[PDB]
Scaffold this active site. Structure first.
Site, short mmCIF file in Angstrom:
data_model
loop_
_atom_site.label_atom_id
_atom_site.label_comp_id
_atom_site.label_asym_id
_atom_site.label_seq_id
_atom_site.Cartn_x
_atom_site.Cartn_y
_atom_site.Cartn_z
CE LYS A 201 9.02 10.69 -19.44
NZ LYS A 201 9.12 11.44 -20.76
CG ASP B 85 7.06 10.27 -29.04
OD1 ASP B 85 7.10 9.57 -30.02
OD2 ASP B 85 7.28 9.88 -27.87
CG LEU C 154 5.10 1.81 -15.81
CD1 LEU C 154 4.56 3.07 -15.31
CD2 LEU C 154 4.55 0.35 -15.66
N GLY C 155 8.47 1.75 -19.30
CA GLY C 155 9.02 2.27 -20.43
C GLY C 155 10.35 2.62 -20.38
CD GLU C 156 15.70 0.70 -20.90
OE1 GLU C 156 15.26 -0.37 -21.20
OE2 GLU C 156 17.00 0.99 -20.56
N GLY C 157 13.48 4.60 -22.87
CA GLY C 157 14.18 5.16 -24.02
C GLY C 157 15.62 5.05 -23.95
N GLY D 103 16.59 7.58 -20.54
CA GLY D 103 15.75 7.48 -19.34
C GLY D 103 14.70 6.43 -19.28
CB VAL E 19 8.23 5.89 -17.46
CG1 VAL E 19 6.78 6.12 -16.73
CG2 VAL E 19 8.32 7.42 -18.15
N1 LIG Z 1 1.95 7.36 -22.12
C1 LIG Z 1 2.69 6.62 -21.80
C2 LIG Z 1 3.62 5.21 -22.10
C3 LIG Z 1 4.28 5.07 -20.71
N2 LIG Z 1 3.39 4.83 -19.56
C4 LIG Z 1 2.87 5.81 -18.57
C5 LIG Z 1 1.89 5.21 -17.58
C6 LIG Z 1 1.50 5.76 -16.73
N3 LIG Z 1 1.41 6.68 -16.27
O1 LIG Z 1 0.69 4.69 -15.97
C7 LIG Z 1 2.13 3.88 -18.29
N4 LIG Z 1 1.14 2.81 -17.61
C8 LIG Z 1 1.46 1.55 -18.04
O2 LIG Z 1 2.24 1.24 -18.87
C9 LIG Z 1 0.64 0.70 -17.10
C10 LIG Z 1 1.05 -0.77 -16.84
C11 LIG Z 1 0.01 -0.74 -17.82
N5 LIG Z 1 2.93 3.82 -19.27
C12 LIG Z 1 5.36 6.21 -20.42
C13 LIG Z 1 6.26 6.52 -21.67
N6 LIG Z 1 7.05 5.33 -21.63
C14 LIG Z 1 8.21 5.50 -22.92
C15 LIG Z 1 9.10 6.46 -22.11
C16 LIG Z 1 9.20 7.73 -22.84
C17 LIG Z 1 10.14 8.86 -22.45
C18 LIG Z 1 11.21 8.22 -21.70
C19 LIG Z 1 12.34 9.41 -21.32
C20 LIG Z 1 12.73 9.28 -19.97
C21 LIG Z 1 13.62 10.33 -19.62
C22 LIG Z 1 14.48 10.99 -20.55
C23 LIG Z 1 14.40 10.61 -22.06
C24 LIG Z 1 13.02 9.62 -22.46
C25 LIG Z 1 11.10 7.07 -21.12
C26 LIG Z 1 10.19 6.08 -21.24
C27 LIG Z 1 6.15 4.25 -21.78
C28 LIG Z 1 5.34 4.02 -20.83
#
Ligand SMILES: N#CCC1(n2cc(C(N)=O)c(NC(=O)C3CC3)n2)CCN(Cc2ccc(-c3ccccc3)cc2)CC1
Ligand SMILES: N#CCC1(n2cc(C(N)=O)c(NC(=O)C3CC3)n2)CCN(Cc2ccc(-c3ccccc3)cc2)CC1
Lengths: 281, 286
Positions: free
Chosen positions: B44, B135, B17-20, B23, B25
């Site tokens: 996550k 953020d 769903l996401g990438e930093g 890490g 999600v």
């Molecule tokens: N809220 C929101 C959007 C994110 N996210 C959380 C959800 C959820 N709970 O449903 C979600 N849902 C969807 O995208 C659905 C398909 C349409 N998107 C969560 C954050 N992520 C970005 C992210 C942030 C931090 C890290 C990270 C992880 C480990 C260490 C350091 C950083 C990784 C990715 C983008 C998607």
């Protein structure tokens, strides 16, 4: 025959001296007799900007000072700038190699010569914007020359600064805070760069005490796109490059006058020449 | 059986769903029965080549979210240990960045102001618990339903010390600078008032239905403009010093733009609060 017109067909490449990512400076032999007896010249040209190199050519053609690299001419096909070749190269190459021959007295005489070259430029209403050891050429043990004018810009009569637009390749560790903060370039900005260049000359351009190495140790090396705002912050809090090893405090004090935060409070090139000549008596 | 304990052998990865930098999600199904009837969860976790403080920081993030309980904050579900993993509820609508461009026809100004109210209540709950989010952007605001949003990521959230007003940051190279207050860009200091400035940018996103051609980054780069991956932040600071701000979103009434501008006062002490913003939106919704 025009002695400042170099024919492309006799300009033979020996090797590269330097590269930006828009062009290069090459060692060539101008060899119209084809027997390898021609003069060696430094040749600035673009990768396959033109208006900018044409302006730089016209600036250097009209500078005549013993501490400014000599214009020799042009090659026109696109355009190449023909300069004298100084085989000792920059202070960055020469100082690490010649520490045993180059004592403090000689470093202060190179500083005076850089200040004379810079003050002649300033008198013609130019701002250099790129004054560093890598742009100071060694003509001999006893003489240096400013060797590149790639960023040199005219200051309009009754303005004090030039405002810059393309800044992405800025040598930020040499820049005065008004350059970092507002892209404004004053003669006082070149004085600040000169202080950093003097710091390099006094450290014999050692890479482990470069302005970049030392500023990164101060602010942290892992800030990416925040590097420049942390550097401006650091300079705001009063922090400066430290006294070079073996550098007398009264030399360090002339260097520190190059780095007062406010352009109007920094020393002139004329005041620096007088300070160094006083130390040399 | 601890209902907050997710076994790895039953956590089936589906997609990112996401990438930093450090890490991701991921969408997973927690499927203990093995027949694909288990619940979808957002997970996550750290990348393998993780790094120095990242595990400590994720374990702090987990403890932060575990103890947040607010209808406009994504729900903690549990952990998976083996390389700890934060398990959250999955919101299939995604973030405002996904949802608003697809749903302009059903999401009118009244619905946009309700979502603004729900973001401010979530933020004011986080502020009430002595956290700065650092953020707050539309990509971190999840859509529960047409009628409800939740703040869905806490990857940069920090505790403000008792009897301090700000948190000073050191790891900053990955900062969302087009959402940051001048005191964050200039001194890496983060006040609750800094989250108010980010809220104002997030409001702008909501009011432009997150269209990429009027993003905070696209609009600031056209102002400053696309200069260097080294001088960009100092030009942005200068732009903001001079008083320049993101323009009023097409169709946004001036009374909404005036609540947004109170977010963007140069001095933190001069900015509106979240409780003030809620009041002003509620006055407009009457
Ligand atoms: N809220 C929101 C959007 C994110 N996210 C959380 C959800 C959820 N709970 O449903 C979600 N849902 C969807 O995208 C659905 C398909 C349409 N998107 C969560 C954050 N992520 C970005 C992210 C942030 C931090 C890290 C990270 C992880 C480990 C260490 C350091 C950083 C990784 C990715 C983008 C998607
Ligand atoms: N001074 C000095 C050092 C440079 N330089 C000039 C000379 C000289 N005249 O003899 C020289 N000599 C040596 O290196 C000898 C071997 C030891 N080095 C000139 C600048 N160059 C870097 C550079 C800067 C700008 C451009 C450029 C060209 C066109 C358009 C845009 C940028 C290209 C290269 C580094 C070497």
């Amino acid at each position: 025959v025009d002695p400042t017109h170099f024919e492309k067909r006799f300009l033979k490449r020996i090797r590269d001296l330097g590269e930006g990512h828009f062009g290069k400076v090459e060692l060539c032999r101008y060899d119209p007799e084809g027997d390898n007896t021609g003069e060696q010249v430094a040749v600035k040209s673009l990768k396959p900007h033109i208006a900018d190199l044409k302006k730089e050519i016209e600036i250097l053609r009209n500078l005549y000072h013993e501490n400014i690299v000599k214009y020799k001419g042009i090659c026109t096909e696109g355009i190449k700038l023909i300069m004298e070749f100084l085989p000792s190269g920059s202070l960055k190459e020469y100082l690490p190699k010649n520490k045993n021959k180059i004592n403090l007295k000689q470093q202060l005489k190179y500083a005076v010569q850089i200040c004379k070259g810079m003050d002649y430029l300033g008198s013609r209403q130019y701002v250099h914007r790129d004054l560093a050891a890598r742009n100071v050429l060694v003509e001999s043990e006893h003489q240096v020359k400013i060797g590149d004018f790639g960023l040199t810009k005219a200051i309009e009569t009754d303005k004090e600064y030039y405002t810059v637009k393309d800044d992405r390749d800025s040598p930020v560790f040499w820049y005065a805070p008004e350059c970092l903060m507002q892209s404004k370039f004053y003669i006082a900005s070149d004085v600040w760069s000169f202080g950093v260049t003097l710091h390099e000359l006094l450290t014999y351009c050692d890479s482990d005490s470069s302005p970049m190495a030392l500023f990164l140790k101060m602010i942290g090396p892992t800030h990416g796109q925040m590097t420049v705002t942390r550097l401006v912050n650091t300079l705001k809090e009063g922090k400066r490059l430290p006294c070079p090893p073996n550098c007398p405090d009264e030399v360090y004090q002339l260097m520190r006058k190059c780095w007062e935060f406010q352009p109007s409070n920094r020393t002139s090139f004329q005041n620096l020449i007088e300070g160094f000549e006083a130390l040399l008596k």
